[PDB]
């Protein structure tokens, strides 16, 4: 019939990109390894302190 349309929803959208996360993963990896090693060493230095 003689129409005039309304509106409808085109699904859903999300704020994600697949490259800034990659950098994030690599950085997390490097940082986590370095942190754990440093703090172990800090423990041994606690031992040598006194």
């Amino acid at each position: 019939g003689w129409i005039g349309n309304g509106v409808y929803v085109s699904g859903v959208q999300r704020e994600y990109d697949a490259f800034i996360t990659n950098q994030l993963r690599g950085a997390q990896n490097q940082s986590s390894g370095l942190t754990t090693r440093y703090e172990q060493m800090s423990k041994i230095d606690n031992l040598l302190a006194d």
Partner: protein, 50 residues
Amino acid sequence: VKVAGITQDFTDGTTTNTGRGLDVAISQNGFFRLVDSNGSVFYSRNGQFK
């Protein structure tokens, strides 16, 4: 007088959404082709297929 006529309008669909994976309707003109138990070829725009 005597009366003789049957004529129809073909403005487009009062449009409705269902999301059922078999509701199909044609925007703009064009019709469907359907075949009966005998293969008789009939034409329709009804979109309720199952």
